[PDB]
């Protein structure tokens, strides 16, 4: 059922690898070969120069679930490879880099390069393990790449339904027309609110436990790119809030924090700043998430919600330029000497982004053990200072 496509410039070994991993034609779509302990289909993306590559790459992006991006290890990273990379940056779908005929290979921006040969199949196992890892994550409900998917999570009666209705009643919104989701456009950009049916579960059904609701909310998070954590401004923070937000964070989702029912809070001039500080104290892992105060009832600041979801989604998807990234890391090291360890100092050689959603970075070092968590946080904050990344977690991995 999973679909795999091989993409790259001419003469990197695509046919050779394709013919090896493919079995019989289905009816172009081929099933995977007998010798493979993986079950999946292959799509042939046969079809100027840039125009022809783009044609192939876009077919893969539409029809496949995982893409193998193949380069030629004998010819190094060519300018034409860098061009294919740029096209492939346009997809959210998993891309695995295979370096055939066996760096700067990390410089392509897709993380670990998998060395292979089409002669005697060296490296194939590891490559196929890496592709197959993605299968479990393939979305059950698929939407066009352009659609931004988000969810609202929060305890019962916080105002999720009311926020959604307040949000959808805006002049900028056109509600459309899988019947669990709600589709709409906002400034003509397409959005999906994941599993609105679960919010409307009440009125048809009694809630006799929250355990299934919690688990259903986790599924909605898995399907979303942005998660709006809605808190009740009247009752304050509770443990269930921390737990579901922690899940979102660990799942690498973009997060926006929404304080609803602000109309009902007895305010002085510092009631908002105190609430904000109370949130930062209870959700110490969500420093990147903006906090929004609104009222679904009076509509106060309702108009700020969609722009915050857009911004978090943008930052979640943000791909940085490598040369700039390295300048930022060297500036960081310049201002703050690296940790030492009984005579051995951490040295940083090179940094690159390896994925998006969330933004993930690899730092090439001396030895990863000398990279302490506190220095890692420091690097993260310097990256945030230079590029923004408001609304999204980021990941930093040290490698030797
Ligand atoms: N040395 C070596 N040559 C290869 C390997 N894989 C493919 N080739 C050769 O490279 C050329 C391009 O192969 P092909 O599969 O047509 O690549 P495509 O143009 O990307 O489909 C052919 O002459 C192949 O015989 C490999 O692993 N090692
Ligand atoms: N005062 C006030 N009440 C609200 C607000 N939003 C929702 N409510 C009320 O809180 C209750 C629960 O709202 P609902 O949208 O069903 O919350 P849900 O369980 O998260 O969907 C309803 O009686 C709403 O009218 C708000 O901004 N201010």
XYZ file of C-alpha atoms and ligand atoms in Angstrom:
456
model
C 0.000 0.000 0.000
C 2.866 2.479 0.700
C 4.280 4.082 -2.492
C 7.991 4.770 -3.022
C 9.556 6.893 -5.789
C 13.159 7.373 -6.827
C 14.129 10.914 -7.840
C 17.365 12.446 -9.115
C 19.226 13.811 -12.139
C 19.985 11.495 -15.117
C 22.804 8.920 -14.730
C 22.960 8.504 -10.943
C 21.714 4.886 -11.068
C 17.941 5.197 -10.603
C 17.004 2.550 -13.185
C 19.583 0.138 -11.791
C 18.320 0.539 -8.220
C 14.665 0.632 -9.359
C 14.978 -2.595 -11.358
C 16.569 -4.314 -8.355
C 13.928 -3.337 -5.756
C 10.916 -3.706 -8.094
C 8.953 -6.884 -8.839
C 6.042 -7.276 -11.275
C 3.947 -4.439 -12.778
C 0.498 -3.745 -11.291
C -2.296 -2.732 -13.710
C 3.355 2.759 -13.967
C 3.133 1.061 -10.563
C 5.327 -1.941 -9.651
C 5.161 -4.064 -6.507
C 8.335 -4.574 -4.430
C 10.638 -7.527 -5.175
C 10.378 -10.994 -3.571
C 13.721 -10.792 -1.790
C 12.603 -7.734 0.184
C 11.153 -8.266 3.644
C 9.119 -5.088 3.081
C 5.753 -4.803 1.347
C 5.277 -1.647 -0.785
C 4.714 -0.332 -4.316
C 7.112 1.591 -6.586
C 6.122 4.357 -8.990
C 8.189 4.882 -12.131
C 8.644 8.622 -12.722
C 9.891 8.367 -16.329
C 7.975 11.294 -17.845
C 15.070 20.638 -21.493
C 17.034 19.773 -18.320
C 15.597 21.603 -15.289
C 12.115 21.249 -16.800
C 12.467 17.443 -17.119
C 13.849 16.946 -13.592
C 11.040 19.135 -12.181
C 8.446 17.044 -14.059
C 9.721 13.816 -12.480
C 10.109 15.321 -8.976
C 6.568 16.732 -8.991
C 5.049 13.379 -10.012
C 6.868 11.766 -7.065
C 5.616 14.528 -4.745
C 2.001 13.950 -5.789
C 1.898 10.140 -5.999
C 4.515 8.757 -3.572
C 4.621 8.523 0.239
C 8.380 8.303 0.581
C 10.926 9.663 -1.842
C 14.431 8.345 -2.384
C 16.585 11.253 -3.566
C 19.548 9.720 -5.381
C 22.887 11.399 -6.128
C 26.157 10.168 -7.680
C 28.900 9.581 -5.078
C 31.652 9.377 -7.712
C 30.747 12.800 -9.166
C 30.251 14.464 -5.746
C 27.504 16.983 -5.007
C 26.933 18.647 -8.410
C 25.074 21.892 -9.057
C 22.334 19.831 -10.727
C 21.938 17.829 -7.456
C 21.562 21.109 -5.536
C 18.813 21.971 -8.034
C 16.879 18.732 -7.434
C 17.196 19.410 -3.685
C 15.611 22.822 -4.136
C 12.593 21.276 -5.873
C 12.290 18.571 -3.185
C 12.288 21.254 -0.434
C 8.715 21.959 -1.556
C 7.305 18.733 -0.059
C 6.381 17.778 3.517
C 6.685 14.103 2.481
C 9.706 12.132 3.802
C 12.826 12.267 1.601
C 15.703 9.816 2.080
C 19.074 10.610 0.502
C 20.874 7.758 -1.237
C 24.443 8.285 -2.431
C 24.983 5.758 -5.230
C 28.133 4.332 -6.903
C 30.099 4.046 -3.649
C 30.754 15.913 2.356
C 28.867 18.132 1.697
C 26.272 15.375 1.247
C 24.746 16.694 4.454
C 24.890 20.099 2.657
C 21.949 18.906 0.535
C 19.706 19.356 3.608
C 18.089 15.913 3.935
C 20.184 14.534 6.775
C 21.999 11.202 6.780
C 23.260 10.153 3.338
C 22.854 6.423 2.737
C 25.770 4.964 0.756
C 24.789 2.328 -1.829
C 25.908 0.465 -4.962
C 23.695 -0.874 -7.756
C 26.312 -3.506 -8.592
C 26.164 -5.847 -5.567
C 23.508 -4.077 -3.535
C 25.858 -2.773 -0.823
C 24.071 -0.430 1.629
C 20.576 -1.401 0.420
C 19.441 -2.841 3.771
C 20.095 0.406 5.652
C 18.508 2.502 2.874
C 15.356 0.360 2.900
C 15.135 0.330 6.690
C 15.242 4.179 6.553
C 12.457 4.314 3.941
C 10.296 1.725 5.740
C 10.578 3.639 9.060
C 8.272 6.255 7.511
C 5.493 3.844 6.533
C 3.756 3.855 9.963
C 3.410 7.665 9.758
C 1.674 7.842 6.379
C -1.567 9.860 6.850
C -4.852 7.934 6.716
C -6.626 11.054 5.425
C -4.575 12.833 2.814
C -4.905 16.512 1.884
C -3.252 18.621 -0.786
C 0.250 19.803 0.251
C -0.983 23.439 0.343
C -3.483 22.808 3.180
C -2.445 23.884 6.677
C -3.840 21.438 9.254
C -4.339 22.447 12.870
C -6.264 21.289 15.936
C -7.590 22.791 19.128
C -7.026 20.839 22.326
C -8.207 21.585 25.855
C -10.291 20.347 28.772
C -14.085 19.996 28.475
C -16.038 23.281 28.400
C -12.984 25.556 27.899
C -14.619 26.902 24.731
C -13.086 24.936 21.831
C -16.395 24.795 19.911
C -17.125 28.442 20.646
C -13.657 29.549 19.476
C -14.057 27.583 16.235
C -17.442 29.234 15.605
C -16.094 32.696 16.508
C -13.092 32.099 14.237
C -15.235 30.880 11.285
C -17.625 33.861 11.435
C -14.906 36.307 10.315
C -15.188 38.206 7.017
C -11.785 36.803 5.975
C -13.096 33.231 6.225
C -15.022 31.127 3.703
C -16.211 27.820 5.192
C -16.137 25.026 2.608
C -19.477 23.911 1.076
C -13.899 12.922 5.617
C -16.695 14.359 7.773
C -14.609 14.599 10.977
C -12.628 17.650 9.778
C -13.724 21.190 8.909
C -12.284 22.863 5.826
C -12.172 26.603 5.190
C -10.116 29.337 3.586
C -8.770 32.381 5.392
C -7.480 35.082 3.059
C -8.014 32.363 0.404
C -5.404 30.073 2.016
C -6.809 26.560 2.678
C -6.972 25.216 6.257
C -8.339 22.104 7.933
C -9.386 21.968 11.575
C -8.694 18.330 12.410
C -11.518 16.314 14.019
C -14.147 18.987 14.689
C -16.566 16.033 15.010
C -14.827 15.123 18.285
C -15.582 18.592 19.673
C -19.237 18.141 18.712
C -19.270 14.643 20.310
C -21.338 16.101 23.180
C -25.075 16.569 22.590
C -25.189 13.143 20.922
C -23.273 11.276 23.627
C -22.690 11.580 27.405
C -19.093 11.979 28.500
C -18.689 9.280 31.156
C -14.848 9.372 31.216
C -12.216 11.613 29.651
C -9.853 8.744 28.818
C -11.136 8.199 25.268
C -11.371 11.951 24.652
C -7.715 12.354 25.671
C -6.662 9.539 23.335
C -8.763 10.982 20.503
C -7.063 14.397 21.104
C -3.616 12.739 20.809
C -4.651 11.332 17.405
C -5.783 14.817 16.301
C -2.361 16.157 17.358
C -0.607 13.444 15.279
C -2.565 14.564 12.230
C -1.875 18.298 12.804
C 1.022 20.596 12.114
C -0.137 23.305 14.581
C -1.747 22.611 17.976
C -3.696 25.338 19.765
C -3.609 24.642 23.513
C -6.681 26.322 24.978
C -6.815 27.189 28.634
C -9.749 28.463 30.669
C -8.827 31.921 32.009
C -11.389 31.516 34.826
C -10.312 28.157 36.320
C -6.573 28.386 35.622
C -4.131 25.601 34.730
C -4.590 21.865 35.464
C -2.516 18.676 35.149
C -4.375 17.353 32.075
C -3.279 20.586 30.304
C 0.413 19.904 30.958
C 0.103 16.306 29.764
C -1.494 16.893 26.361
C 0.739 19.951 25.691
C 3.792 17.843 26.632
C 2.632 15.279 24.067
C 2.358 17.976 21.372
C 5.854 19.249 22.258
C 7.399 15.790 22.224
C 5.627 15.094 18.940
C 7.539 18.079 17.439
C 4.392 20.089 16.675
C 4.097 23.843 16.399
C 2.192 25.190 19.431
C 0.131 28.320 20.193
C -1.322 28.844 23.678
C -4.800 30.337 23.863
C -6.329 31.738 27.038
C -10.099 31.725 26.500
C -12.860 33.398 28.579
C -10.789 36.505 29.223
C -14.041 38.431 29.399
C -14.869 36.622 32.657
C -11.609 37.291 34.527
C -11.501 40.123 37.074
C -8.596 42.157 35.755
C -6.260 44.724 37.166
C -3.408 46.208 35.093
C -1.163 43.175 35.772
C -3.647 40.233 35.782
C -2.588 39.365 32.187
C 1.169 39.487 32.923
C 0.633 37.293 36.009
C -1.342 34.732 33.979
C 1.393 34.742 31.307
C 4.078 34.171 33.946
C 1.960 31.418 35.544
C 1.756 29.687 32.139
C 5.537 29.946 31.623
C 6.049 28.457 35.123
C 3.681 25.506 34.461
C 4.659 24.849 30.829
C 8.438 25.336 31.032
C 8.932 23.293 27.833
C 6.784 25.765 25.773
C 8.934 28.929 25.888
C 8.703 29.173 22.066
C 4.862 29.202 22.068
C 3.079 32.556 21.915
C 0.336 33.210 24.478
C -2.930 34.731 23.238
C -5.726 36.182 25.382
C -9.195 36.220 23.831
C -12.928 35.715 24.370
C -15.027 33.515 22.069
C -18.040 35.153 23.760
C -17.327 38.871 23.147
C -15.032 38.143 20.147
C -12.260 40.161 21.778
C -8.973 39.432 19.987
C -10.552 36.467 18.151
C -8.977 37.996 15.039
C -5.491 37.312 16.385
C -5.876 33.515 16.328
C -5.553 32.702 12.599
C -2.507 34.970 12.088
C -0.770 33.197 15.031
C -1.547 29.737 13.533
C -0.165 30.902 10.160
C 3.030 32.240 11.804
C 3.641 29.091 13.869
C 3.079 26.943 10.749
C 5.528 29.073 8.755
C 8.219 28.814 11.446
C 7.555 25.097 11.825
C 8.310 24.708 8.098
C 11.263 27.101 7.962
C 14.416 26.057 6.112
C 17.556 28.093 6.888
C 20.566 28.813 4.605
C 23.588 26.779 5.666
C 26.221 29.523 5.354
C 24.168 31.861 7.588
C 23.503 29.036 10.075
C 27.257 28.468 10.405
C 27.962 32.186 10.946
C 25.382 32.170 13.780
C 26.931 29.120 15.421
C 30.469 30.573 15.146
C 29.234 33.860 16.653
C 27.724 31.814 19.517
C 30.979 29.944 20.145
C 32.908 33.258 19.914
C 30.817 34.887 22.693
C 30.527 31.783 24.864
C 33.507 29.380 25.104
C 32.567 25.713 24.819
C 32.408 23.217 27.744
C 35.665 21.487 28.729
C 36.088 18.017 30.269
C 39.261 17.141 32.182
C 41.485 18.600 29.431
C 39.194 18.013 26.415
C 37.232 20.905 24.906
C 34.166 20.661 22.659
C 34.971 21.832 19.125
C 32.274 22.577 16.525
C 33.176 22.082 12.829
C 30.036 22.423 10.752
C 26.278 22.781 11.185
C 23.378 22.069 8.811
C 19.585 21.733 8.878
C 18.492 18.099 8.292
C 14.665 18.395 8.275
C 11.664 20.637 8.818
C 8.448 20.288 10.776
C 10.001 20.708 13.244
C 13.279 22.402 12.239
C 16.101 20.015 13.041
C 19.831 20.637 12.970
C 22.985 18.535 13.154
C 26.217 19.923 14.563
C 29.435 18.179 13.626
C 31.727 18.048 16.599
C 34.862 16.760 18.252
C 32.896 14.275 20.335
C 29.123 14.489 21.121
C 29.640 13.732 24.875
C 31.276 17.146 25.394
C 28.084 18.843 24.151
C 26.202 19.396 27.417
C 22.463 19.991 27.541
C 23.008 23.542 28.826
C 25.343 24.385 25.924
C 22.801 22.806 23.565
C 20.032 25.118 24.953
C 22.414 28.046 24.526
C 22.941 27.134 20.860
C 19.163 26.823 20.403
C 18.576 30.302 21.841
C 21.221 31.822 19.520
C 19.550 30.110 16.553
C 16.168 31.497 17.743
C 17.676 34.988 18.146
C 18.915 34.977 14.523
C 16.083 33.285 12.675
C 12.955 33.637 14.845
C 11.280 30.168 15.119
C 8.485 31.509 17.329
C 5.780 28.864 17.767
C 7.939 25.822 17.034
C 10.279 23.526 18.919
C 13.670 23.033 17.323
C 15.993 20.000 17.561
C 19.809 19.976 17.747
C 21.821 16.723 17.379
C 25.580 16.579 17.963
C 27.481 14.123 15.721
C 31.129 13.027 15.381
N 30.025 1.809 -10.872
C 28.678 1.817 -10.752
N 27.921 2.134 -11.842
C 26.561 2.158 -11.778
C 25.917 1.832 -10.493
N 24.589 1.927 -10.699
C 24.394 2.284 -11.997
N 25.571 2.416 -12.643
C 25.769 2.802 -14.068
O 25.505 4.202 -14.248
C 24.805 4.443 -15.478
C 23.455 5.104 -15.208
O 22.561 4.082 -14.767
P 20.966 4.239 -14.748
O 20.437 3.175 -13.819
O 20.459 4.299 -16.172
O 20.835 5.689 -14.052
P 19.620 6.700 -14.344
O 20.028 7.390 -15.627
O 19.613 7.622 -13.144
O 18.422 5.789 -14.470
C 24.646 3.085 -16.156
O 25.646 2.947 -17.173
C 24.840 2.074 -15.031
O 25.392 0.832 -15.482
C 26.813 1.499 -9.351
O 26.348 1.213 -8.231
N 28.142 1.512 -9.552
N -17.573 33.822 29.581
C -17.218 33.074 28.507
N -17.813 31.869 28.318
C -17.495 31.079 27.259
C -16.464 31.551 26.316
N -16.336 30.605 25.380
C -17.187 29.601 25.697
N -17.883 29.884 26.816
C -18.920 29.025 27.437
O -18.357 27.855 28.044
C -19.185 26.714 27.781
C -18.413 25.630 27.035
O -18.156 26.068 25.701
P -17.870 25.017 24.528
O -17.613 25.799 23.267
O -18.915 23.922 24.537
O -16.516 24.375 25.096
P -15.887 23.004 24.569
O -16.367 21.952 25.542
O -14.400 23.222 24.665
O -16.377 22.878 23.150
C -20.366 27.207 26.963
O -21.460 27.474 27.842
C -19.877 28.507 26.371
O -20.961 29.400 26.100
C -15.862 32.871 26.595
O -14.989 33.346 25.851
N -16.279 33.554 27.669
